[PDB]
């Protein structure tokens, strides 16, 4: 699928359809301040192609939205390369939201979760965030509906059964799989995968990559002559050059600007 830039969607649902072909959002996604929307506007609205967001996901004051299970059913990774003040996921004053329902979310690579002041919001106690984030210590999940009657066959962790909705369990893989994910039969995804795969032990069948993405494959590092871009994909010189001619090269990365003490040889940063 297509790589889209970060988006800020407000007021109307019109611009939301700009996500229709994105597999990856290279940036953040903010959806906010939709006062006129009602449940009927979301009933048949879905972006099943979205697998990953490199920065953060933020939802604030979106009326009529009761779950995210149909909007982002396949969102698997939020990388958190850039954060919203230290948060990779923000759900705030979502007045009609009854559940998150991000039943494919397996990993938040960097940052924390802030879920606050969502009257109506249930199915939070049923999520084991320690399976999704290395540290839950900085999570801030308060002032939500959470007696909820969170009814979940589901895995149990410390003990409580874990689910996203009445019809979706939280996926938990054998410990040997680590963060790589597994198939329904419990077979580990390849060590370069992150979260999930269509087939076991194949780096071309990953839903997302643990390290970097190149040529339909998950790789540990970008080898020369490719450069690390946006901390998730490998790009060639020409690509970095095209960005520059409306970006620089430093330490095998294509980056926005030369660090302190460096200047650009006309595309390599030199001291």
């Amino acid at each position: 699928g297509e790589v889209c830039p970060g988006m800020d969607i407000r007021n109307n649902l019109t611009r939301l359809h700009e996500l229709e072909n994105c597999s990856v959002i290279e940036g953040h996604l903010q959806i906010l301040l939709m006062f006129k929307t009602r449940p009927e506007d979301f009933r048949d609205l879905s972006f099943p192609k979205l697998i990953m967001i490199t920065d953060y996901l933020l939802l604030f004051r979106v009326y009529g939205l009761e779950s995210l299970k149909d909007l982002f059913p396949n969102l698997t990774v939020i990388r958190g390369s850039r954060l919203f003040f230290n948060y990779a996921l923000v759900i705030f004053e979502m007045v009609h939201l009854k559940e998150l329902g991000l039943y494919n979310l397996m990993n938040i690579t960097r940052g924390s979760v802030r879920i606050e002041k969502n009257n109506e919001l249930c199915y939070l106690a049923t999520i084991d965030w320690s399976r999704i984030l290395d540290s839950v210590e900085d999570n801030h999940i308060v002032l939500n509906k959470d007696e909820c009657g969170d009814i979940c066959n589901c895995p149990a962790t410390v003990f409580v059964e874990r689910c996203w909705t009445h019809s979706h369990c939280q996926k938990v893989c054998p410990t040997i799989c680590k963060s790589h994910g597994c198939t329904a039969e419990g077979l580990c995804c390849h060590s370069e995968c992150l979260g999930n795969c269509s087939q076991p032990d194949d780096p071309t069948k990953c839903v997302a990559c643990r390290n970097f993405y190149l040529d339909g494959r998950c790789v540990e590092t970008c080898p020369p002559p490719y450069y690390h871009f946006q901390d998730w994909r490998c790009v060639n010189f020409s690509f970095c050059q095209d960005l520059h001619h409306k970006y620089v090269i430093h330490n095998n990365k294509c980056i926005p600007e030369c660090p302190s003490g460096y200047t650009m040889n006309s595309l390599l940063c030199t001291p």
Partner: antibody
Amino acid sequence: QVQLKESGPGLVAPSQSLSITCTVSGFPLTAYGVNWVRQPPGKGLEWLGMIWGDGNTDYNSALKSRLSISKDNSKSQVFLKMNSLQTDDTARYYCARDPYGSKPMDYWGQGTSVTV
Amino acid sequence: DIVMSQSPSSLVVSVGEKVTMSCKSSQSLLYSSNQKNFLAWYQQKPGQSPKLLIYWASTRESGVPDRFTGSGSGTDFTLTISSVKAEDLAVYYCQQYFRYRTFGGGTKLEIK
């Protein structure tokens, strides 16, 4: 499951060209690199060149002038062509899978014995 | 271009003995981005194709016995066989894969 096999001509007259087809299976040429390495009888390994998933190539700086590597992703084939062979080009020629951002050349073909 | 220099060119050893062999690169193979060395070791048994043993200078390929250990960083690398087995007779090659590939001269493992 991963396989690579070279189809070479066996014999080349001095000053003629060498053409070899490496047919692969079990992985996509779009996601893996394929190199060509040769070994003169009882001598070491000489890296000749490679073709990346994107079709870009890298050739041995010493033999850059004599080599061409091309491929057909849909037919799972990689093609080597070398200009004006001489007796010292007598060697076994191998094609091998290069998973570029992970491990160096892993799966090798049994090579094609080529005699000038 | 990177020159890979292997030592010794040949050696004779008995079954059970430890063997150490060297590979020196003309320039550092240490990749700043991951702090790994872009070096591999291959074993070529008589009449066979090369087989990958080690990559990233010290990571053992799946199926490779624990008796094989790769070490070193930057320019100077070592392959050690803790206790040689009869099946280990082969020529051992190092290869750099940083930019393009280059092989050493190979150390020859003879067994008496």
